[PDB]
Every structure is written in structure tokens, then in C-alpha cells.
């Protein structure tokens, strides 16, 4: 393919060459951004940025800007050129719209498809994320179609596809790849066990699990891998409005797809943008026509490093800590979900602790988790000792019976996919007449 | 491959030839599947157009028995997508498609007499979970360049309140949802402060399927949404779209893409027209060949020419709504009741109802706002007296009884798993965040 117009891993031999692949797109990107009502209004009465050098002066685009411009204030092409329209997860009251041409979709699908394990025609790919307005289900399906994998559209949060039916599909279709968030990986494992199947042995064709959408510690990621037989759990970082911006290498670090976007770290205190360090993730996608974004702040706290990785990819690594501002403090001690997660998932695998939750009170950390009765007291004691050793916070830890946080019906209930029925026989329950879901 | 378009045939004889010329390929493809290889093991299988007249019907129970890949005629490497049918979960029905199979599927859906255009914004409000329906409409929208808004259905992510907001704010021009969902969206619109007959000026057509739909109900759904076309099609997960509405309001069989026959289940005879069970042999599919697949829907196929000038037979689908219940001296079909319910004046706003056939009496409930309820009860009773003569027990209910207010107004944030909460936060959304 002498013919392909977007860069691939291996097209650049140095960071200087990568920087050139980026800057050579900025005149097109800056001209396209100005066609949107939002950027045309932003630079009204001034000379707009046109050149690679002008980009250093470009003002950040905030989430609140995208919400204020709902639905099509960020639109730079005729609506006739849109292929799909999406809205972000989170608050329903203040939606964020994103939208993509067919050519925009090719870039999106390529970035998702950068899975170090490969996606092949030989694969059966269960897409277990939502298709309702959000991009995630559509994105995985598009990458599956691109690479010829058989796509099984599992959807998520749909009454049509409960966990019991997904477990049966995983086993009976010999599914080789999955796409779902890390909590859904443990939900599927709990559903398998409730169906009398061992996730570590009874799914021999499952070769990788693709995941995103949650901050994921290496301790949790490795436990999720071990639960499913030691297979790779392949993380990516993305959003509805950016698509996939980073993907895992074989060493287990996420690398920024810097050939497809200019990535900057925003220090909200000084207002400076830097190519690496700690701060808020800023993205300028290079290969989109419909919805240009100039220095869009995802407002995730990230650590970007240019330090080499054992994978040898010539791309910076990124750790995603969480959403900016989300931390809690109890003693002098900062309590992060990420620190608690590392302690919970360091309990021996034999204790089967997967489901937990915690509440920061001013004085004390309240934490609950499900564990089988025989190991429950051990789990409470060891997790307490871990909190003492690592954080020194006062705690109130309660072990719960399985079925308490995650009900049995979520794991085992089957649901017929009915249609509206208006006339029933005497013996039939007519309660499913109009509300048939 | 080269697939026919409306207008490629000038007569029924030419249509019959477009079909028969595909049958050698279709019969050889079917034989590659374990199911048809086993069916014709130790015989000479059918090879020619003439041999097709002798081909045994394929039943739904065959597709269930062959779960998952007994109907598969290509290497799995060539599959693009895998689907399972709606209905019983305990006994799944698998279907699957190559990329080229998908082009035929998308083309058949896209035969919408109103057109699908790049100028369109197309809300897909059917499920994407395993079933084909959401994927099919999305594929046809992508094929014709319409902006696809993936609404999904039966998803906690996309309640009615949010779909009504999307209809209005995105100037949606086309919808895809079942006929019950058309009335659910109308009730949700009023609950959002929007009049379905006036406040959606860019909505130009509503595409629908999946339910038996009387012309009386279809015309009422049109009137509720300001007199815009309600464009019906007939399909299934295992066949795709097999008939679509013409501008005269009849569904025409897509006979250029499939051989349609009417099955008498008592004699087992197959006829090109008349009353009986819908039998389909798709002509342009490689992955999952079907020879005379019996959808087991009760249909009436007619060869009578239509004012639309399409040279294709028309089909009415009675289905499960065609099957009588004896009550009084009389026999009552869902389709006959539906015609009487939707013959009540539009201004009574009767959209949601249900009925139970007892041996002695028809029990029927419907929502009607105060103060038209007792008029509606009386007129519907008189209609049942005049038309059916069945004893009835009719109850008018307050709106919010059959279709709860919560279904129409509830908004739901799309949350992710959260493990650490502040004191004042509800931590019940920790692991069960849907
Ligand atoms: N691998 C990851 N690690 C950590 N956080 C992640 C990861 N992937 C996604 N996220 C988080 O999820 C966000 C994107 O959520 P997603 O639903 O995929 O898009 P969205 O529709 O923009 N939702 P939202 O921003 O939450 O309103 C990112 O900004 C991060 O906060
Ligand atoms: N226009 C229509 N009029 C009447 N019935 C229809 C119409 N369209 C679809 N149907 C019914 O819906 C069935 C197909 O349901 P659908 O969910 O679209 O496919 P499926 O998931 O394959 N279901 P099934 O094969 O019956 O188990 C048809 O066989 C008919 O019974
Ligand atoms: Mg368009
Ligand atoms: Mg394949
Ligand atoms: Zn690496
Ligand atoms: Zn016609």
C-alpha cells in the first residue's frame, strides 16, 4: 500500500520525523477548524491561525465549549457528508455531540484496530459495549469489519443481551476476542461461574480481552487476566469525541497515537501546554473533517512520558489516573480509587474478591466487598492490614454475602426478546402486552 | 456480483427468469452446509431450476437444531457478522452474513419509496443486541449516505425522553422503529411538551416493521405524526427485508432477490400466490443458504397489478394476529380488534390497549384521558356489537396505567463503574451502574 494516506507504526524512525508527520497536517487542520461556527466565532475580528508555528498560540477547547455548541456548532462540513452522529456518556441534561464522515470513520477504525494481539478473519469478536448513541459499540464493530473478524454484537445495558446469554455465546461460538469495560470482564467471569463454567479453563479459544473506559491499575488488569486463564487484557484510552488516542503495547503500557493527533499536557495552574509530564490530556486530532478540535481538553489527569519502553515503539506512554478533581482525603492520607483497587486486587485470587465499593467519610474509610463465607474473615483482616501498612487511614471494612452487591438475577436470568402483543389467550399473562421489553 | 434493481424486468416471465438463472448457484451453495449435505446424503441433490420444484421445506426447528453453524456454507473467516433471532432465548436461532451478503441486505432495506438521501438524518430506534434490525437500518443508512443516529432500543442508555429530544434538536427526517414504538414516541413527545402533529416539521417519514399492522392503525400512526408517510416492510433476522411498501400503501415482495411461495401446512403444497405460510429462498447469500425456509407467518400473496406500477406481487401479513379465538358465537383476531380500537376518533387519544380472549367474553382495557373515557368505552362496545357480536368487558384506564409515566419521562445518566464515593454520594451505582 504505497497508496495509503494516513501514517502507520513504523513510518517514522525518530521523534523529529514524528513531529514532521504532525506539523505537515496543521495547515489543512487549521483551515478545516475555521469552517465550524465555533472557531469562526472564536477568531472573528482577528487573523486566524493558518501555519504549524501559529498552532503554539491556539487557545484550549473545553468540554463546556462542546456542550454550549450542542448540537452542530463544531460542524465544519455539510450535514450531507456525516456518516454517524454520537453523544457522550455521563450527564443526560447536558449532552456532548460528536459526528464523523465516512473518511473520519476510517481513521477511527484504524486506531481501534491497533491491538498488539492483532484482529484477524480467524477471530470471532464479541462487542459487549453499548450501541445506544455512544460510539464504543460502533467503533469496535467498525474495526472488526475492517480486519474481517466475525462481529457478534452483544451490545451492553440492553434487555436483549443479559450476561447469562453472553456466557453461552462466549462458549458455544468459540469467541476469540471481547470488547467491554474492566467491570464487565469481572461480571462475565461471575456469570460464567454461576453457569458452572471456569473462566480460567472452559473458554480455550478466548485469546484476548480488549478493554477501556475505566482507570485500570496493573494489579487489577493482571488479576482480570488470571481470572480468564492468563490471556492478555489489552487496554486502550479514548472518548466519543476523540476516538482511541492510546493503546497497549506487549509490555502492558498505553502509547499515544501521536501520528493521528498532537497530544499536549495542560497544567491548569500555570496554563502551560507541554509535550510530556503530569496534567490534563489535550488532543488535536489530525485526520477528521466533520468536527475539528483544536487543543481539546479531555480534563483527564494523565502522566505522559517520552522515556523508552521495552516494546521499542517510537511513541510516548500515558498513564490515566482518573478525572481531574476526583480525589478524596481522610487523615493527611490521599485515598484514590486506584490505590484502594491495588489493595483489593492484591488479596489472593482464591478469596474471589471482585466486587467492592468504598465511601470517604471525613474521619474513616467505609469499604464493602463480596466474598464467599469461608474466606470472608481472612479477606476483611488482610485488606485492613493492607490499608494500615499502605495508607494508615482509619477504616470500617465489611465482607458481604455473594448476591448482595451483584444480584444472582443479573448473573443467571434469561430474557425472551418479545414484541408487542395486544390479544392474549385466557391462560397467558397479558402483562407483556405494550411494555414487552 | 450483479444484483437486479426495480425496473430490470418488464414482465412476470422476465422476473421468473432472473430467479431461475440463480438457482443452480443457490442449490450448489446450500449443499456445502452440513444441514443440506446431510439432507441429500445418499441421494443425488437438486442441481437445476426444474429440480427446485421438488425441494423439501426448511423449518425454524431445523435452524434451532443446527445451532450454531449447521447452516454454514463458507469458512468462518468469510463471516462479517453473526446474529440471533428475537423470541425464545432457551432455543436460539443463529444467522450470519459475509460482506457481500450484507450488500444484498442493505439494498433490500433501502428500497423505501420515500427514498433515503444524504439530506436525511435517520434515527435507528430498534435493538443492536444480537438481532439484525438496528444493524440492518444502520447499513442501509450508510449505503445511501443518511446521517445515522444509533438510538438502539431496550437499552438503559437511550430512554424515550432522550429519543424525543434527539428527534426535535437534530431535525431528524426518518425513523426506524416498530409500530408500538411510534405511539410510545408520540406519548413521550407530549410528556416532553412537544406536539407530534406539529413540532417535528423536518420529520418526513417513519419506517416500521416487526408487528402485524392494519391499514387503520398505520393511517392513525401517520395522523398522530402530522399525516407523514408510515412506510412498512416485512422481514426477519434470518432473511432480512423480503417486502416493502409502495406509494399506494401495499407491501411488494422483493422477488428479484428471493423466490417467494405460499405453503399449505395440511397438504404441504407450495403455490406462487394465495393464502398460507410465507416460504423464502434467498438468491444472493453465501454464508447461510436457505432452501424454501418457512417463516411460518400466515400471509396472502396476490399477483394483481398495483397502481405503483412495480411488477411484483403484493403481500399482507396476518401472522399470529390472524389466528382466531372463539369467544361468543364469533371468532376474534388481533387484526380485527386493532381495526375497531384505531377506528375510534383520533381526538380520544386511544393508542395503548390489550385484550384477553376468555371462552365466554372478550376482556379489553385501553388508556384514554379524562374526559373522553366513557364515550370511548361506549363507542368501542357498540363497534364490537356491530362488527363481531362477542360479549365484552371493556375498561377505560387513566393514561399512565398500561404505559407508566416513568417510561415516557425518565432520563438516565450513562454512568461507568465507580468504586470510591464521597459521603454525600449514593454508592448503589458502584458495580450495578446501568
Ligand atoms: N484506559 C482508560 N483509562 C482511564 N480512563 C479511561 C480510559 N479509557 C477511557 N477513560 C475515561 O473515559 C472517558 C471517556 O468516556 P467514554 O464514554 O469512552 O467517552 P465520553 O462519551 O466522552 N464520556 P464522558 O467524558 O465520561 O462524559 C475518558 O475521558 C476517561 O475519563
Ligand atoms: N410488516 C410485518 N407485518 C407483520 N409481521 C411482521 C412484519 N415484519 C415482521 N413481522 C413479524 O416478525 C417476524 C420476524 O421478527 P424479527 O425480530 O424481525 O426477526 P427474528 O429476530 O428473526 N424473529 P423470529 O425468526 O420469528 O424468531 C416475522 O417472521 C413476522 O412474524
Ligand atoms: Mg448525511
Ligand atoms: Mg470472519
Ligand atoms: Zn510499550
Ligand atoms: Zn404497489
Numbering used by the authors:
A (entry chain B): 0 to 436
B (entry chain A): 3 to 436
Question: What does the study report here?
Answer:
We reconstituted the biosynthesis of the benzoxazole moiety found in nataxazole by adding two enzymes (NatL2, NatAM), to 3‐HAA, ATP, and Mg2+. We have determined the structures of both NatL2 (homologue of BomJ) and NatAM (homologue of BomN) from the antitumor nataxazole pathway. We show NatL2 catalyzes ester not, as previously reported, amide formation; the amide is a shunt product. NatAM catalyzes benzoxazole from this ester by a mechanism that we propose involves shuttling of protons to control the fate of a hemiorthoamide intermediate.
The β‐phosphate of AMPPNP interacts with the side chains of Ser87, Ser88, and Thr239, and backbone amides of Ser88 and Thr239, while the γ‐phosphate has fewer interactions making hydrogen bonds with a water molecule and the side chain of Ser88. There was no electron density for bound Mg2+.
